[PDB]
Amino acid sequence: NLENAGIRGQYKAGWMGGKPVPGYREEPGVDPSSTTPTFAALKLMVDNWRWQGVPFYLRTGKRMPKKVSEIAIQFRQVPLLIFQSVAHQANPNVLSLRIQPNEGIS
């Protein structure tokens, strides 16, 4: 069932920077009623002795709000929850690298 490991897409008319932006099937050269995708997403898995059962999610696209590039790693949750605190403690700690403007490690 390929519908569980990938979704295509295409961008139509909208707004980018306060100025109207034409859709994909309007550009000077493209053929109306096309099928070439623009947004792609996947879900890969690794089968070895140290990455068993940890899914990887990939993404890309065009005409998104801003340029970035991230590699976000998310860690598990603590076993005991004595410090229940507030907001359901739904804030697991992550470690994110950056390969775009404002390079750094956070």
Place this chain on the structure above:
Amino acid sequence: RTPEPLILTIFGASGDLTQRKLVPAIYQMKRERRLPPELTVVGFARRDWSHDHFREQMRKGIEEFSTGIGSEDLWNEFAQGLFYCSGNMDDPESYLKLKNFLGELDEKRNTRGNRVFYLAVSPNFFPPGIKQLGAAGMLSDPVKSRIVIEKPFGRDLSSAQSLNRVVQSVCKENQVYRIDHYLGKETVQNLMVFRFANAIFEPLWNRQFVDHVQITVAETVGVEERAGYYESAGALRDMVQNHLMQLFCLTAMDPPNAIDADSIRNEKVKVLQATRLADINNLENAGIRGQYKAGWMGGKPVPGYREEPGVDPSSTTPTFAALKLMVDNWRWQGVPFYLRTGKRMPKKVSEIAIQFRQVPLLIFQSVAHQANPNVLSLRIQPNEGISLRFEAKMPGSELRTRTVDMDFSYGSSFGVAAADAYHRLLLDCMLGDQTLFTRADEVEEAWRVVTPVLSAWDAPSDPLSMPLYEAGTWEPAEAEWLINKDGRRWRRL
């Protein structure tokens, strides 16, 4: 090693089971020249007996329920030291007479002023006896006085708390010995020395590898001439509170920092403080009960529970009791435990099984597309030992894997066997250390853990709704559904 002179003034009044269990045992122990040569025993009952009267009564008992007297003059020498007093369990004059008796009869060897009171009476008599002892000021010096309390210690949370509070006001701790269940020596020590003296077994006890634990005990006799007591009892109040909940604490305990008794008991109390029923809201996911009927154990048919000498025609007393627990500390998070017990099962096994996780990925394909995970299977009785089960290669020309195993038996590869346990417990009480005697916090903890299901089951219901199982089968079907709902299986022993 060698204890000190002492006076064993039994407070258990006049009975049959208590004397039959105690007097032959203490006589046998004294015969084996281990206690100090000179000792005294003081008799207390609710009747008038001549010295020769109960002397010959005890002589008849010991001759009937042992191998007789090893010597002839030694019998009279031992009997010189067995006296009987007069009194009751409520009269203040009774304790006054006992005090006079002791203060006059302690002249021989002075007994160094040490005394101990072994108590063996009907459970309802503990509060009056302890209150009378406390008001009378029998024991004041906390160096030579001890008090022993026998089973049962209670029946529910409130009674246990009340008894603990009452006994706390009279004297401090380090003097009460809540003897009842006996998980004898040469088992607890064996488990410690096997677990905390190797460097290849300790790093394999985490949520990382261990996936599943389960503990089982099983009997064969069922119900016997003790119907008078068992008529007001249950599996929950007979085994799950006294034996299984100590085996579980011993299995899941943290490594202690010293070999002293205080550290071990402290660790046991700490671990038995994060255990809870799996599904407290709905008892149908964490509890099943039963009652055996229409048996065929052995070569002859055996009658059912509701139809035998001494019964309640419409009763609901259980005899099988599963359970589920789930510790949630920093080390055993998300790992379930199962407890099972019952009566009238074929074999009398009592084991502990640990099932490890599967390998992260299967390079090698086994037979029938399935593999048997590794298992450590510490056995308790009979033939105590340790077993392991790993995987090897079938001698064929293809990558086909079977399961082999290795064994180890204590009896054959070490000595022959051991001795009785009651004498060991009495000697340990004599010496003055408390390694296996429970403290007064874990009793309350166990009662708190098992209270919800106890209250739910105690409410009377339809007598026709009790699940039943024929004597010979392992379990009723509901327990099978409980275990199978997740994807595991009872170990067919």
Place this chain on the structure above:
Amino acid sequence: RTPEPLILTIFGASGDLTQRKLVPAIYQMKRERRLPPELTVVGFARRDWSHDHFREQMRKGIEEFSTGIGSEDLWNEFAQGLFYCSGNMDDPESYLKLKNFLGELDEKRNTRGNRVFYLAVSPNFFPPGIKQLGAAGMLSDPVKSRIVIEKPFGRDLSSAQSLNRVVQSVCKENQVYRIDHYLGKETVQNLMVFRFANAIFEPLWNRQFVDHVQITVAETVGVEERAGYYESAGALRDMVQNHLMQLFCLTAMDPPNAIDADSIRNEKVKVLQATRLADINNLENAGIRGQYKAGWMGGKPVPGYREEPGVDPSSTTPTFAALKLMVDNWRWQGVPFYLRTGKRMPKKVSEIAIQFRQVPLLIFQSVAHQANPNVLSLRIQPNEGISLRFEAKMPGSELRTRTVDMDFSYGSSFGVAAADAYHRLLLDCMLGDQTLFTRADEVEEAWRVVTPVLSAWDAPSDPLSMPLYEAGTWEPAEAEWLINKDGRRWRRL
């Protein structure tokens, strides 16, 4: 799964040991339907043989050095594929004659074209033979021609490099089989399955639980025959590079991702690429020589090394070795690997002993105050199996530990061994699977590892500077000093 029929050419045949090493094996294979009835063999070399002479000599060989000829009709049905074509080793005309003979045999016998070339010439003739074989272009198609080169693959690093360069320029590195070694299809697969199918033995294999490993291989037979063969080699190109460097690779190898030969060989080379001796500058902490003198064996006198036929009474060829290798990767950093071998030692045995570490802190008391740590004892010699030793409890009223072990022998649950290793080797060569053979990189890396000690010991020195051990003692005391310099002792075995 019987391989397809084909024709064999045996270069340098009709010599010595070729009959007893090939004819009985192929005869037994054919009798056991291992090959189709379309199998033929062809002789070679220069002496003027005869087809009837070939039949008579083969009959004599099978009668004398095998079970027998079985049924006469069986030999009649066999005797159609044994021809001969005399020719010089370095004669291109004889090579063209061989090609014409092969073509005629293909046309008549209808062998379908596929071929395997077997080489059994003296080891000082590989370059000319390979070059002249490649001159005529007998090896063009990929599955049509496989060439097997017998022991040994050179002596020093330079000779091996030259041979590799010569081989690389004639045929693709997919048909050359270097045979070599003797580890069959039992031990290798058994060890790999045991390591990579359990969920307990894997996490305890890195550098934070293991302390050191030892690998022992011992024999009791003397130099026996082949004095000329031994005098030119010594026990460093005979048993310490062929055999003893396979146990190391199999023991210290990272897990693979498949089963075919590619992944296994790649992992083996990757492991072998990051090893080195201990003290390269000073060769006194990383090597000891030896030589066996006169002694007692089996209650009978046995002469020393310098009394056999053909050995001059001044030779310095070793018959004992001892190294100390060390790995330098992310997993085995700082754990020595003591190796061993020898001759005339008693109790022929092989072993792989792994010794774990001690516990962080000790709270218990040892009987001998030694506290022997746990050991795994993988065995390869007869009585194969796995044995592990841990601690238990001394019966009595005291806390002491005593070392006891489990056991599991392959000879009880199994014992039906496979055929001769040579038969399986030949079958695998026919069908095609390079799992059990060696690539070029492995050979070059082993030679690079052993180069310094070999060069140092090859240089001439004082005739009486060889440390000496009599026949029967385990080793000269120098090896004992090498192992005791750090504290860990040689395994008593």
